Amino acid sequence: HWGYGKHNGPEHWHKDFPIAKGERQSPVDIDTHTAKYDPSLKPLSVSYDQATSLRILNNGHAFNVEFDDSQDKAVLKGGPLDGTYRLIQFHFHWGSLDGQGSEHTVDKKKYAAELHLVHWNTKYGDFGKAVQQPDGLAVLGIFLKVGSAKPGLQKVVDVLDSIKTKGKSADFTNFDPRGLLPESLDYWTYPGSLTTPPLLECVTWIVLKEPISVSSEQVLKFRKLNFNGEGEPEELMVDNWRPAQPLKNRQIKASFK
Numbered sequence: 498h499w500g501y502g503k504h505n506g507p508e509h510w511h512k513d514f515p516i517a518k519g520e521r522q523s524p525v526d527i528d529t530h531t532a533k534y535d536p537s538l539k540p541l542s543v544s545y546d547q548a549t550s551l552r553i554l555n556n557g558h559a560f561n562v563e564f565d566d567s568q569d570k571a572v573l574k575g576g577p578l579d580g581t582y583r584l585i586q587f588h589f590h591w592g593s594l595d596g597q598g599s600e601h602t603v604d605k606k607k608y609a610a611e612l613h614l615v616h617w618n619t620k621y622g623d624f625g626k627a628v629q630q631p632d633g634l635a636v637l638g639i640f641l642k643v644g645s646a647k648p649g650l651q652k653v654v655d656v657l658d659s660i661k662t663k664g665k666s667a668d669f670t671n672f673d674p675r676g677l678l679p680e681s682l683d684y685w686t687y688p689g690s691l692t693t694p695p696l697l698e699c700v701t702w703i704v705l706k707e708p709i710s711v712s713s714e715q716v717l718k719f720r721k722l723n724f725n726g727e728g729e730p731e732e733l734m735v736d737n738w739r740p741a742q743p744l745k746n747r748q749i750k751a752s753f754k
């Protein structure tokens with residue numbers, strides 16, 4: 498089945514998911530010189546005060562921190578979006594080394610990891626129906642650079658020992674995702690896709706310009722997770738990123754000058 502290795506990695510996905518070679522795939526390189534400022538964009542509105550985290554799950558390709566999305570508790574709106582998108586989960590993609598790990602790049606620069614906060618458009622009723630639509634999702638992407646620790650990340654780092662292998666989950670209530678955000682909400686935006694199979698083209702990407710700093714020890718702990726299940730040979734969960742894909746007939750817009 499799909500993964501990130503030589504025999505089942507990004508270069509193979511198109512055989513089971515032909516949309517891998519579609520017209521709006523993600524991630525992409527963000528060429529900051531060619532991203533035009535769009536003064537009709539709005540400030541983003543990130544309303545996470547009432548976020549209800551539930552659980553953390555190692556799904557065999559990342560760990561997802563999941564939220565109660567059965568009411569408008571943690572929502573994204575404004576910016577490029579029409580209407581209201583509800584937070585369902587966040588996750589990261591990261592490298593085996595601090596020089597790689599992000600999916601988006603910025604003038605070909607790779608960051609050590611990238612956080613994705615995944616939201617679905619409430620006009621579609623739930624996540625499953627939203628992923629059948631070209632405006633079903635909004636993903637807020639945030640780059641991680643290695644430097645000072647990110648205090649708000651530490652409760653995620655400290656539970657990873659309990660979900661080392663594929664299929665393990667742990668209670669993860671009362672986590673506040675506001676502690677993962679940088680100071681500025683300046684962003685780039687473009688239409689794209691999920692970056693994992695099934696690679697569906699549902700996503701308004703909103704990628705923050707300001708990275709967050711995380712400590713080398715924090716990202717080291719991500720790299721101790723396993724892609725395999727318990728009792729299977731150990732394969733460290735590293736390099737779970739898809740490389741930049743062709744921009745095709747797309748323009749990336751900037752919310753800032």
Ligand SMILES: Cc1cc(=S)c(O)co1
Pocket residue numbers: 613615636691692693
């Ligand atoms: C739904 C979903 C979204 C992203 S961004 C991902 O990597 C996996 O699954």
Ligand SMILES: [Zn+2]
Pocket residue numbers: 588589590613692
């Ligand atoms: Zn992702």
